[PDB]
Amino acid sequence: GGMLCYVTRPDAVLMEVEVEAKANGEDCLNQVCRRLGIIEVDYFGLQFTGSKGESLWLNLRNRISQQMDGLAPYRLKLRVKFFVEPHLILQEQTRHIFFLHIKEALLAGHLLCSPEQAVELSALLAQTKFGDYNQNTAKYNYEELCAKELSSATLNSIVAKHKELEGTSQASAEYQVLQIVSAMENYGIEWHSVRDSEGQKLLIGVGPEGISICKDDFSPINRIAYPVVQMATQSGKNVYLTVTKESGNSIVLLFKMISTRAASGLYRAITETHAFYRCDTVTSAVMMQYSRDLKGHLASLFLNLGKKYVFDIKRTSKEVYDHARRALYN
């Protein structure tokens, strides 16, 4: 009955969003964006946590009430779904929200960086929160982004770099954070917790370039691009990716997920990310998938001749007459 949604913004602020009882996910997010002054809505999504504690994206085309059936009070987290190059974001509020999202990922160690990267980033984050250097108010955060803190030895370089930023406006400092983070290898990569057969706890990253495979954010086993991935399917708690090897050999990768919703989430993450970054239009992405289905249906039609089409006759009426002529002459 004209249901209430508790939307958490990336600056930790809770919004009370009243939507129509049978409203879609797009209706929530649109009202959230209208109230935040966001025009570039298509970069955003609403994250929620399912029955099995798994983080899922709200489907903008379906009803909220169906998608979040059991789980009430309806709690949604406003998040950037599609990361693009910071300069390509035309509105300043949208840029600030990308920064809010990126700062949170950094301060939670969800994007680990080299000591050299962590020095400039720690100084830029200081300039953003407090402004130009002041001994009274100048707290830093080097430990969260990096592996270990080098104490005074590195703090002297971070206090040195924050001093070089004297004059850098809040917006500019934020833009540089976005610029540095957008250059990173794992920028715009969405990590999903899976199972390789029964053996290992693998982590799948869906990003603009393609699917990334690694065991708990370690050395990437395969940084597979999208043209290499032939097909993908979802069955229950499983995800069946059809990826082809350099020799033409189609090696079907298997992943086991915590739930059916989580398995759907990854399948949708592959289809959606590919279409967003690799297709001209949604129509084009719909076509590409359709074409791949017909193409594949015909590839199975020619994998299995005169056995089924057996005839008892050795000759036709014409052949009989000609064989009788030839037989007598020769």
Author numbering: -1 to 302, 307 to 332
Sentences from the study reporting this entry:
The second pathway involves the sterol-regulated inducible degrader of the LDLR (IDOL, also known as MYLIP), which is an E3 ubiquitin ligase that promotes the ubiquitylation and subsequent lysosomal degradation of the LDLR. Two distinct protein domains are present in IDOL: an N-terminal FERM (band 4.1/ezrin/radixin/moesin) and a C-terminal RING domain. In contrast to secreted PCSK9, which interacts with the LDLR extracellularly, IDOL is a 45-kDa cytoplasmic protein that interacts with the intracellular tail of the LDLR via its FERM domain. Here we present two crystal structures of the FERM domain of human IDOL.
However, our structure shows that F3ab runs from 186 to 278 and that the region spanning residues 279–332 is clearly outside the cloverleaf region. Based on the obtained structure, we propose to redefine IDOL FERM boundaries as shown in Fig. 1A, with the extra region in FERM (which spans residues 279–344) divided into three subdomains to accentuate the extension away from the F3ab lobe: F3c′ (residues 279–300), F3c″ (residues 301–332), and F3c‴ (residues 333–344), with the latter not traceable in the electron density map. The FERM344 domain packs as a tetramer in the crystal created by crystallographic symmetry operations. Its extended F3c′-F3c″ region (residues 279–332) interacts extensively with F1 and F3 of a symmetry-related molecule, burying a substantial surface area of 2537 Å2. In the FERM344 structure, the F3c′ is helical and positioned over the F3ab domain, obscuring the access to the peptide binding site. If this particular position is retained in full-length IDOL, it could prevent the interaction with the LDLR intracellular tail, suggesting a possible form of autoinhibition.
